[PDB]
């Protein structure tokens, strides 16, 4: 099966009587889901993946742009991306796969899992958890220009409220637990140097903050207290929200080979958000 770029189709369980943007978009763009599809596990097969060169990501990005540029209530719904006639999607089943190189347990499917297309910076919300241990993924770890996508194995709840001023609460215990596991994984990759975190250092104003959309309202939260009982982040709005933090986008500082490496929250290339969900998939021509 050659790898092939083709135009995917989408499937969802949107409702046609519902006014919210994602349902309206999916009702015209997508077909109904197969509620119970079969998955063929491929015995003895190995295939090479490259999550950083995956035309599925480009396609999802265009679709999500279309959704936002189409449009009330705004709650992301699951969208499946699906291989058209003559094609299939290969799914990597290796539970600690770095997204590049060989994968052993592979299965073929017509569609991805249902992905919520959540638009956010710094923290990945409401996504897929790693099945086993925390996983970190980068295109090249020794290039500090390449962002690191972290996938957590346990969700961290983030609850946000408004009183223009607003805040988000995170459990301090759970967050310190999450940072410890991330540190262990970063050391494996950086010659067991000491790991430091620091707040975002620049870029567009919405990437220096944790920014996200909470049913209609755009929230911009200061994450210094996360990267430096509950942790309360101050936010500006430009209504309650509870989400699961399921991942992080990090960037490593450049410089001299000190005894330490420092990492900062980043993001802004929404294509990394889509990679964090699509890393295990690849389109092939079956014919």
């Amino acid at each position: 099966w050659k790898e092939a770029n083709t135009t995917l189709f989408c499937a969802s369980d949107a409702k046609a009587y519902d006014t919210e943007a994602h349902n309206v978009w999916a009702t015209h763009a997508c077909v109904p889901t197969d509620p119970n599809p079969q998955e063929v596990v491929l015995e003895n097969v190995t295939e090479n993946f490259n999550m950083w060169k995956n035309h599925m990501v480009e396609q999802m990005h265009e679709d999500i742009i279309s959704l936002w540029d189409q449009s009330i209530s705004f709650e992301p719904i699951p969208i499946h991306f699906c291989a058209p006639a003559g094609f299939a999607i290969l799914k990597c089943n290796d539970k600690k796969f770095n997204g590049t190189g060989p994968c052993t347990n592979v299965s073929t499917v017509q569609c991805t899992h249902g992905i919520r297309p959540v638009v956010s910076t710094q923290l990945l919300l409401n996504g897929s958890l790693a099945e086993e241990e925390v996983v970190i993924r980068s295109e090249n770890f020794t290039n500090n220009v390449k962002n690191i996508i972290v996938q957590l194995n346990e969700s961290v709840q983030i609850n946000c409220t408004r009183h223009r001023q607003a805040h988000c609460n995170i459990s301090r215990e759970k967050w310190q637990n999450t940072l410890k596991q991330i540190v262990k994984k970063l050391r494996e990759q950086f010659k067991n140097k000491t790991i430091a975190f620091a707040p975002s250092s620049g870029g567009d104003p919405e990437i220096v903050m944790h920014s996200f959309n909470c049913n209609g309202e755009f929230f911009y939260c200061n994450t210094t207290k996360l990267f430096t009982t509950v942790i309360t982040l101050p936010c500006r709005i430009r209504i309650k929200c509870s989400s699961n933090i399921t991942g992080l986008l990090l960037t490593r500082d450049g410089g001299v080979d000190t005894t330490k490496e420092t990492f900062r929250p980043g993001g802004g290339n929404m294509k990394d958000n889509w990679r964090s969900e699509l890393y295990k998939y690849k389109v092939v021509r079956i014919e």
Partner: nanobody
Amino acid sequence: VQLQESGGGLVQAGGSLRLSCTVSARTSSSHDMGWFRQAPGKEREFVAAISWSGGTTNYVDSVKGRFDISKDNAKNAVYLQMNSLKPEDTAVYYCAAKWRPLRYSDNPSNSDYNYWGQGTQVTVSS
């Protein structure tokens, strides 16, 4: 290709070129479009950007007063007028797009753009 640049050429210092980029990919009111360039041997650097909806612009200091970035939304087009060209302007010029759905300002980004063209080659002699 999503983005395709044209207008590159060989020019004499003090001359002018006009670069064009047609954006075949999906655009939106929260996009920025820009131009970046890479001179032989050196790293890629920002040149100019424009907000797709608002038209706010930004330039690298070494082109101010000489380069102008403009757009035509109905043609999905962005343009870089380059006047008073200097040998230091010699480079591959890339058009780029960035979707910024969460932006709260019209000022365009100068880094980390979603996708890039193949580039158009510019040589400025003398």
